[PDB]
Amino acid sequence: DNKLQVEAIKRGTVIDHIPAQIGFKLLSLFKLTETDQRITIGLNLPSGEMGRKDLIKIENTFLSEDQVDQLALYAPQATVNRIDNYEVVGKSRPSLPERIDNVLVCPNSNCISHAEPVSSSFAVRKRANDIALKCKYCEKEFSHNVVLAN
Amino acid sequence: THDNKLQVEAIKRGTVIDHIPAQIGFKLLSLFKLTETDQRITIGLNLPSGEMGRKDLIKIENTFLSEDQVDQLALYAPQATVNRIDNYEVVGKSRPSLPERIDNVLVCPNSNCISHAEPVSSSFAVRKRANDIALKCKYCEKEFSHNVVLAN
Amino acid sequence: ANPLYQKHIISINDLSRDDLNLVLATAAKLKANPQPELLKHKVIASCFFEASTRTRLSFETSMHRLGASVVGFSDSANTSLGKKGETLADTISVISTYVDAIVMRHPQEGAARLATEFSGNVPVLNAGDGSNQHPTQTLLDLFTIQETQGRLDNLHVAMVGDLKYGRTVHSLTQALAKFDGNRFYFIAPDALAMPQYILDMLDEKGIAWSLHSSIEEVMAEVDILYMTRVQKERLDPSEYANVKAQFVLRASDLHNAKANMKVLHPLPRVDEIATDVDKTPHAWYFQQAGNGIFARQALLALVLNRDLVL
Amino acid sequence: ANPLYQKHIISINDLSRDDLNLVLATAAKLKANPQPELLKHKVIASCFFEASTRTRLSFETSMHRLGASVVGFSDSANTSLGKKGETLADTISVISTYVDAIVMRHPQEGAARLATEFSGNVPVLNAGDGSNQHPTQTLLDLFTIQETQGRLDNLHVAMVGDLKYGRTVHSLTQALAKFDGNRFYFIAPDALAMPQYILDMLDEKGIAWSLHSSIEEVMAEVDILYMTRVQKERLDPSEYANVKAQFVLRASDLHNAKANMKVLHPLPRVDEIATDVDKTPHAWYFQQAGNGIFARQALLALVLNRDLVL
Amino acid sequence: ANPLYQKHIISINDLSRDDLNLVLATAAKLKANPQPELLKHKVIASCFFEASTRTRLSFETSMHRLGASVVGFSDSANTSLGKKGETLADTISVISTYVDAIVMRHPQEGAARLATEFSGNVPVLNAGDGSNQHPTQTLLDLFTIQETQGRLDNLHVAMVGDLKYGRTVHSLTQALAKFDGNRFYFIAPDALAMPQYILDMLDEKGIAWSLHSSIEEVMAEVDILYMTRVQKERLDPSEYANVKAQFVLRASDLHNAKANMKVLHPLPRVDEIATDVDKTPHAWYFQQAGNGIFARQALLALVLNRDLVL
Numbered sequence A: 001d002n003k004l005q006v007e008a009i010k011r012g013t014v015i016d017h018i019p020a021q022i023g024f025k026l027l028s029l030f031k032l033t034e035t036d037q038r039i040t041i042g043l044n045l046p047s048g049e050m051g052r053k054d055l056i057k058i059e060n061t062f063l064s065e066d067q068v069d070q071l072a073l074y075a076p077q078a079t080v081n082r083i084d085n086y087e088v089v090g091k092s093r094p095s096l097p098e099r100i101d102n103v104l105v106c107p108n109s110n111c112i113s114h115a116e117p118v119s120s121s122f123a124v125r126k127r128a129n130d131i132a133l134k135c136k137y138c139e140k141e142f143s144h145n146v147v148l149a150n
Numbered sequence B: 001t002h003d004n005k006l007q008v009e010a011i012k013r014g015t016v017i018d019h020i021p022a023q024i025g026f027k028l029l030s031l032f033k034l035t036e037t038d039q040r041i042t043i044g045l046n047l048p049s050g051e052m053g054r055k056d057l058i059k060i061e062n063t064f065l066s067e068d069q070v071d072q073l074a075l076y077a078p079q080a081t082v083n084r085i086d087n088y089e090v091v092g093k094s095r096p097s098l099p100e101r102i103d104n105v106l107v108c109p110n111s112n113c114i115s116h117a118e119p120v121s122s123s124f125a126v127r128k129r130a131n132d133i134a135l136k137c138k139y140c141e142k143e144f145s146h147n148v149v150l151a152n
Numbered sequence C, D, E: 001a002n003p004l005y006q007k008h009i010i011s012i013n014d015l016s017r018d019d020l021n022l023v024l025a026t027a028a029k030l031k032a033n034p035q036p037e038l039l040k041h042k043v044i045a046s047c048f049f050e051a052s053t054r055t056r057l058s059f060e061t062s063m064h065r066l067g068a069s070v071v072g073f074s075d076s077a078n079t080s081l082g083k084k085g086e087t088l089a090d091t092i093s094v095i096s097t098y099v100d101a102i103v104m105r106h107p108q109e110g111a112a113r114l115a116t117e118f119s120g121n122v123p124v125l126n127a128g129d130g131s132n133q134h135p136t137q138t139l140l141d142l143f144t145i146q147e148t149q150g151r152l153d154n155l156h157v158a159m160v161g162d163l164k165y166g167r168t169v170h171s172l173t174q175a176l177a178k179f180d181g182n183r184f185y186f187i188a189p190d191a192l193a194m195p196q197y198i199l200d201m202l203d204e205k206g207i208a209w210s211l212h213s214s215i216e217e218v219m220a221e222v223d224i225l226y227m228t229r230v231q232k233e234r235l236d237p238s239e240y241a242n243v244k245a246q247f248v249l250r251a252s253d254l255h256n257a258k259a260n261m262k263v264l265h266p267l268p269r270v271d272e273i274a275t276d277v278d279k280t281p282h283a284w285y286f287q288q289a290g291n292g293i294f295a296r297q298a299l300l301a302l303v304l305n306r307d308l309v310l
């Protein structure tokens, strides 16, 4: 027959219930694949809670509450499982962070952040049912949908 | 037997791209736009390998690489293995054949090449060599290492 | 220490109603009773990376009326940033080893905020950063509005012209919104409208504001007519239809205006205020400019002198 | 049809020894007895996107000597590509609906090849594309070498100066390498050496070539001394140390020359050939230029006429 | 004499339906069987005071195909008007003592009309005068429409883009309006709408026209989709919001097109027609350009020959 098998991880993180099409986006942003650690990704998996979902497993790697919170912009209904000795030892859900640093680029062409050795930074807030991001430097505010990443 | 919620199903029909060198797997996913599908996909990055120590691995259901993608794969990951699967079985297995031309995806490193300014598809004569592989631009006629070019 | 001692002064959005009132109270006192040696032995940097007449000269004048010395530049072309490719970060990193405060104007939004991240313990005072903020303009404006209306609350305030790129009206609207019951009329071309982050802030505070297409609609009601220049140096090429003042105030436009109403303008004006307005008792933009001395003296005192003055 | 009828003439790489000999034989005949109506009723575009004296004027004269009409431009600045943003692609797309052949010089490598993808059945002749190829220069060069030496085989040929950016020597080396037993001497600054893909071609054909740091080093044995200009409009700023001629030929350097040796230069020269060379029997760059007429007539005649009887 | 013998060709307004049909019939004949000596012993001036690729090169090619000689310039910078202050009046006054006809393009409206007041018996052909008229473009346009549609009546014609500054559509609309039962769809930004004097002419002839904000709105019913370039060298600074193509045609927009529909564009295009359109059967802008040869030959032949027998 065959030797097909996916060996459960001893220690690390399992990001579950990622909405369809978002899994690859998370990998791209947070540079999750820039590591020598074993990673396992399932995309378009069947789900009871969601119908379709993506799933990211990363060995020997953990996310702080803030790192988990960054995920709220993209996958708010995701579950982040911390794993030690093959056991789910922690389950967290992303709560909207107060700031998003480093990964996004201010869309204002005249912002000082583009010309100088600083890291991007936006304050995060709910506006209607949109998420508004206010650049720490130029203080202009944008819909998160138009604020690109690096 | 509790654990039966942890074992990915084999594919009935589709492709398994194996022996991808480390750090290439994720690159292939973007370049081939593979994740832009509703088909089930599983990916292993930095997996143990007898043949090559560490490797990446991509499996896609009900889906096959296009001739474009197969030709480009020969360049990105020459030692990678393409497995075609029907009825849960490997019916075809091969290292992708090097093509003679690669169009559209590469960028000529000659900055004064006309191909940058104009609405034409890039094109490079591909010839296999000793240590690397040579790409000669259809327009400027200059020849480069795929190393210099694949640093697009 | 007073609340503002050694504080960076970057954005009105970082200040409270109490901070603003503290500046104004200090201004009254120093105008009443100048303390010509309050800042003796201070050396302050005056660093202007874009053009200025009022802000730079009033700031430097304020520094000398308080006894401080002044170093700096009125353009960047002959700094090492101008000729040798130095970053602004490195410029601030060295200048902040020389002086007791840095006053800076810069053409990019966020410049003054960035400077604070490299100035260590040296306070940065934002003399204007692109089309973002102009907090010391707001201080002198508040002082002037108080001087002529007797209060900062329950006022009718019209702002006219380029509201999108007016760093002056961004700062001033945020500041007046910290006071109770003020009402706003925004008279701007569609393309240069007040930005959404300002309007959202007003809505959150339940402040009333509306858009008008003419000065005449609001003239009867207004206590403060705040005219602005089109910020042509900030305009995208797509916005070049808006270079000419869309609204021109003339003396005849002032018939049905309240006797308490003042016309303000951060200056320079192009044609948005005709010269015939100058002689009318409503014109107060030159008086407004002169109050920059008291506001800026006040701010330097609060930032560089530990105790409240008397 | 003759082998060159309706063919694009883009790169010496695409031509055989027989093709080159055909042009040379055809040129010898047209020089011997002219055919003034050979291209009657042809209109040919001369499109120069960078400077030229010899190539454009000899090409146009050639067209007229064969009875053709000429349209075009010596500068792109007043075409719609120069003023309205038009691509080279579209430019060729329309011009190829007007004329029977297109002669083009362009500052980017590949421009002529690209034109062939838009010109349909209209042949494109490459009058120079960046630092890549210059096939018609090579045609006249071969013709001149053949005339003076009696052969294109077993020659000793030195090429001096900017070999990196010299499209002239890229084409000439390739062509001479299609003949037997030629030996090459490359005299160039390191930063401007003959490129490797040329040397590789010489190697895989087992052709002897060597590098030298002086002309006197090889003066006594060369049949053809091919001088070149530093292509300063092509140099990277990092290569400005090489702007001046590194090798300057003077009449006195020719004391040990073979009597039959000729000095060639595709022209224009700056200082690499001193004016005292001009009077010597070895100077042949002006006669070479004059031969552009017969090579270019020959090329046009073979491309636009199915069969020639001469 | 034919109706157009020795006539100036300045504005479509001065021509009748019969005049236009004469050129079209004459062009069809010259395309069918060429007359290479028809303008033998004529010398014609080609005077371009602004950029051109198609108009100047097709005109000059046309002259050569008919056996005429050509003198002139593609830039005024090296004429005595460009360097010595000479008026256009004097320029035409002397050139009209040399040549048998004058083809002129100029950046000011009226320039060609003015030339006719100084050229005496020498006919002036307007190759474009500012944003006013472009009669020879219209001649080739009509010829292309006639070829592809079989008629110049009862067409559905859409014109897209910059209709305000498009001298091409000013002339084309006027000409099509001399035929019966055509219907027009104008798809343009407000700031660049078809001018009122054109619409008025349509009204007083009872011709149906309407305005639309999209191409898909009319795709299913148009016989001719006439795309245009934004005339950015004509825009007032206040109109720079319109510099980018507002309407971009792509292959996928043609899914519901009439099978016989053709996409035209006087060229050059910037982005208003995507390159993926080129391969579709509806793309006809290059064939259109190619027809400039037959329309311009026809015009020259009718103006310079008393009677034609073909």
Ligand SMILES: Nc1ncnc2c1ncn2[C@@H]1O[C@H](COP(=O)(O)OP(=O)(O)OP(=O)(O)O)[C@@H](O)[C@H]1O
Binding pocket: A007, A008, A009, A010, A014, A016, A057, A079, A081, A083, A086, A087, A088, B005, B006
């Ligand atoms: N040792 C392990 N190695 C790899 N994956 C694991 C391991 N342990 C758990 N997982 C995966 O992490 C997630 C853990 O969730 P859990 O074990 O609670 O299942 P669950 O009850 O379905 O979770 P939820 O209630 O959040 O849907 C599952 O997606 C499971 O596949």
Ligand SMILES: Nc1ncnc2c1ncn2[C@@H]1O[C@H](COP(=O)(O)OP(=O)(O)OP(=O)(O)O)[C@@H](O)[C@H]1O
Binding pocket: A006, A016, A017, A040, A041, A042, A045, A046, A047, A048, A049, A050, A053, A055, A057, B005, B006, B007, B008, B009, B042, B043
């Ligand atoms: N390491 C892995 N790589 C790829 N796919 C996996 C991996 N582990 C499990 N899967 C697949 O993920 C799918 C969903 O499993 P999971 O345990 O998340 O479902 P669930 O918990 O019952 O549903 P819900 O997502 O609602 O909690 C299964 O079909 C399984 O085959």
Ligand SMILES: Nc1ncnc2c1ncn2[C@@H]1O[C@H](COP(=O)(O)OP(=O)(O)OP(=O)(O)O)[C@@H](O)[C@H]1O
Binding pocket: A002, A003, A004, B009, B010, B011, B012, B016, B018, B059, B081, B083, B085, B088, B089, B090
């Ligand atoms: N039905 C299937 N579904 C999913 N994955 C499969 C399926 N069949 C095979 N594979 C995977 O595709 C690859 C097929 O290789 P194969 O079965 O020949 O093993 P192998 O002998 O190790 O191959 P190789 O010699 O190329 O290393 C394996 O990595 C396997 O895990």
Ligand SMILES: Nc1ncnc2c1ncn2[C@@H]1O[C@H](COP(=O)(O)OP(=O)(O)OP(=O)(O)O)[C@@H](O)[C@H]1O
Binding pocket: A003, A004, A005, A006, A007, A040, B008, B019, B042, B043, B044, B047, B048, B049, B050, B051, B052, B055, B057, B059
């Ligand atoms: N679907 C999968 N997802 C993630 N990891 C996998 C999957 N299938 C196999 N692996 C991992 O990859 C490793 C090697 O897989 P496999 O047996 O297919 O290759 P191999 O033949 O052992 O190695 P190689 O062919 O490279 O010498 C295994 O140890 C397993 O942990």
Ligand SMILES: O=C(O)C[C@H](NC(=O)CP(=O)(O)O)C(=O)O
Binding pocket: C051, C052, C053, C054, C055, C056, C128, C134, C137, C167, C168, C228, C229, C266, C267, C268
């Ligand atoms: O420039 C304006 O129109 C308003 C305002 N003006 C000033 O600060 C006065 P000045 O530029 O002379 O220092 C500004 O934002 O710079």
Ligand SMILES: O=C(O)C[C@H](NC(=O)CP(=O)(O)O)C(=O)O
Binding pocket: D051, D052, D053, D054, D055, D056, D128, D134, D137, D167, D168, D228, D229, D266, D267, D268
């Ligand atoms: O420019 C050179 O030095 C060599 C060569 N020269 C010529 O073709 C002569 P011209 O530029 O006058 O046509 C060239 O590549 O253009």
Ligand SMILES: O=C(O)C[C@H](NC(=O)CP(=O)(O)O)C(=O)O
Binding pocket: D080, D084, E051, E052, E053, E054, E055, E056, E128, E134, E137, E167, E168, E228, E229, E266, E267, E268
């Ligand atoms: O320029 C245009 O967009 C349309 C029109 N175009 C042409 O005549 C083609 P050309 O400018 O190449 O002669 C014109 O009015 O000049």
Ligand SMILES: [Mg+2]
Binding pocket: none
């Ligand atoms: Mg679950």
Ligand SMILES: [Mg+2]
Binding pocket: none
């Ligand atoms: Mg294996």
Ligand SMILES: [Zn+2]
Binding pocket: A106, A107, A108, A111, A112, A113, A135, A136, A137, A138, A139, A140, C110
């Ligand atoms: Zn910003």
Ligand SMILES: [Zn+2]
Binding pocket: B108, B109, B110, B113, B114, B115, B137, B138, B139, B140, B141, B142, D110
């Ligand atoms: Zn190239």
